[PDB]
């Protein structure tokens with residue numbers, strides 16, 4: 001692990017810390033309850049949802065969502081969070097060496113297919129087996145409450161929890177996750193790329209730094225890099241299924257609206 005490779009890892013780590021409001025260190029501090037006796041407000045049923053939404057009234061009233069079905073309200077708010085994360089991933093990508101120099105349409109394409117893989121990767125940091133932190137760690141929506149919603153909404157998040165439990169068992173830290181997210185974005189085989197050669201060059205550099213970083217930071221998890229290559233493949237499959245579910249909601253749910261700022265990402269994705 002050469003000094004230049006360590007420096008690239010720390011600079012990507014820095015960009016990740018400066019661009020994402022929530023990181024795994026903060027998440028685990030809250031989920032563990034060590035730094036405080038004031039835990040997040042728990043949304044575990046329809047009544048505690050409605051209580052939480054008293055705080056979120058202005059968010060709901062903004063788009064006239066407040067009289068919608070609870071399932072629609074919940075995932076309106078979740079969409080708003082995705083849009084926020086997409087904005088942060090877009091700034092973060094500037095710190096990947098070479099990304100900003102790519103053809104603008106290639107940057108758009110890399111983000112189009114990459115953001116949700118990174119989103120579900122990073123979501124793992126705010127999940128445990130019982131639920132997920134929401135609202136910058138201030139609330140906690142239980143896994144069972146999400147499974148209790150009417151179909152198809154009860155099937156949206158459960159496969160993300162299933163992915164996260166195995167991902168979290170890898171015990172990645174934020175230095176690892178920042179390079180993983182960088183590697184997710186630099187995939188050379190997204191549909192519609194223009195300069196595949198330039199991108200593969202950029203990808204090989206990030207994947208090389210990632211492998212050596214993992215070997216240095218988790219010396220006792222010898223095949224951690226191969227394990228994370230498989231997670232990258234699992235995430236691409238997870239996102240493909242998510243897109244198909246989004247498509248089914250679009251076709252079968254009349255009163256649910258796809259956030260303007262996510263319509264373009266999903267348009268013709270898979």
Ligand SMILES: CC(C)(Oc1ccc(C(=O)c2ccc(Cl)cc2)cc1)C(=O)O
Pocket residue numbers: 043049052056059073074075077078080081134135136139141
């Ligand atoms: C500033 C504030 C409160 O920031 C939020 C950040 C994240 C979320 C969520 O992701 C969320 C999703 C579903 C529920 Cl049920 C509750 C919360 C909501 C609000 C807002 O924008 O009003």
Ligand SMILES: CC(C)(Oc1ccc(C(=O)c2ccc(Cl)cc2)cc1)C(=O)O
Pocket residue numbers: 072075076078079082083156246247249250251256257258259262
């Ligand atoms: C992770 C998340 C929030 O997952 C979704 C979950 C539910 C919906 C919807 O409720 C919906 C509403 C209208 C349409 Cl047309 C399609 C879907 C959208 C995305 C995302 O992808 O950011």
